């Protein structure tokens, strides 16, 4: 039950949705905000911690047009995973190369 | 068109009361074609203005020259031909006070228009025939290009 | 009818307080409450719809009195 999506209004307009992410902090939210704010379609993306005591972040994505907002959020998570995969491979290759020169 | 006003302005002073701010400078200017004096705040970090510069200042009701006043929201990402492609600096703001000249007791024609660009103020002062088409609570685009 | 048309703050506090005690003691609720478990919240909802069964009797200092219905009084 980590992700609960709350639509802005009773009409359930898809363009504005707030994703409440449980067991989360600034580390996932700030990194995700940068990845999902590099999308041209997302007009507004921001994260807010409801209280310091509760470990939940509310992320609000407001899209430019008819995009449901699940699609921008999902694309941002996919991009963050790819950025992590590239950094891990590049870091490991560089570390191995350094040890070899030392030897 | 959707142009309200257009003239060439010469910068006459940059900071009258000292450099109160870093990014913003209070440009006092005077126009050639009409007897218009202009107070204008500009961001001099992104756009640097010197004490001798001459610039062309257009105020427009719409940024698309076909006269479509359709502005539900402004999308920076969208790319279409517009008026801003010919100009270097653009601001969006609201006309918020039209006020009469107090300095003559009879037979006067000078008017002041005040526009606020999110707190960057403009006073445009001149003959009433040149300030026509300004109305309170109207939203206008300033456009500005320096001339060689 | 000489007394003020507007309901006083003191009048609103007592009307809500008596209504809430009546609702908390199993009185009928005329507002079709939706998901409300607190008598004071239910009472405030009744006042907004102007459906509270209480009459305010305003006593003048001499001893004369005028009765104003909760619905008739303007609520600010």
């Amino acid at each position: 039950k980590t992700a609960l999506e709350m639509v802005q209004a009773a009409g359930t307009d898809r363009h504005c949705v707030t994703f409440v992410l449980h067991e989360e902090d600034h580390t996932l939210g700030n990194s995700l905000r940068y990845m999902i704010m590099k999308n041209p379609e997302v007009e507004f993306c921001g994260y807010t911690t409801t209280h310091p005591s509760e470990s939940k972040i509310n992320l609000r994505i407001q899209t430019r047009g008819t995009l449901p907002a699940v699609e921008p959020f999902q694309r941002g998570l996919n991009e963050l995973m790819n950025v992590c995969q590239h950094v891990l491979d590049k870091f490991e290759a560089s570390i191995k190369d350094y040890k070899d020169q030392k030897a | 068109a959707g142009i309200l006003f257009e003239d060439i302005f010469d910068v006459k002073d940059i900071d009258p009361e000292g450099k109160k701010f870093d990014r913003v400078s209070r440009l006092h200017c005077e126009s050639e074609s009409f007897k218009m004096d202009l107070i204008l705040d500009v961001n001099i970090q992104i756009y640097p203005v010197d004490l001798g510069d001459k610039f062309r200042l257009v105020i427009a009701s719409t940024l698309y020259e076909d006269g479509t006043l359709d502005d539900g929201e402004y999308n920076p990402t969208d790319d279409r031909p517009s008026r801003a492609d010919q100009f270097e600096y653009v601001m969006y703001g609201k006309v918020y006070r039209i006020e009469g000249d107090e300095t003559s007791t009879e037979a006067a024609t000078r008017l002041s228009a005040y526009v606020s660009y999110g707190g960057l103020l403009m006073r445009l002062q001149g003959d009433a025939n040149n300030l026509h088409g300004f109305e309170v609570d109207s939203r206008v685009y300033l456009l500005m290009k320096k001339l060689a | 009818r000489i007394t003020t048309p507007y309901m006083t703050k003191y009048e609103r506090a007592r009307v809500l307080g008596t209504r809430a005690l009546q609702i908390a003691m199993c009185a009928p609720v005329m507002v079709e409450l939706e998901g409300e478990t607190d008598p004071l919240l239910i009472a405030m909802k009744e006042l907004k719809a102007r459906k509270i069964p209480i009459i305010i009797r305003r006593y003048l200092p001499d001893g004369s009195y005028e009765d104003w219905g909760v619905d008739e009084l303007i609520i600010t």
Partner: protein
């Protein structure tokens, strides 16, 4: 001062902004004033001595 004519005919229409007032604004003004006066009266029941006591004491 500006030679405005009350019939509305004068050509540079911006002159009617200078001290503008409309019937709708006059009607809303008088209702707002009259309402704010009635709601500003000291409501019956008010423990007005205790407010007086504390306002001089504090």
């Amino acid at each position: 001062k500006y030679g405005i004519n009350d019939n509305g005919t004068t050509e540079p229409r911006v002159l009617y902004q200078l001290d503008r007032i409309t019937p709708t604004q006059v009607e809303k003004f008088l209702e707002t004033c009259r309402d704010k006066y009635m709601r500003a009266q000291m409501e019956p029941g008010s423990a007005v001595g205790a407010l007086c006591a504390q306002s001089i004491g504090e």
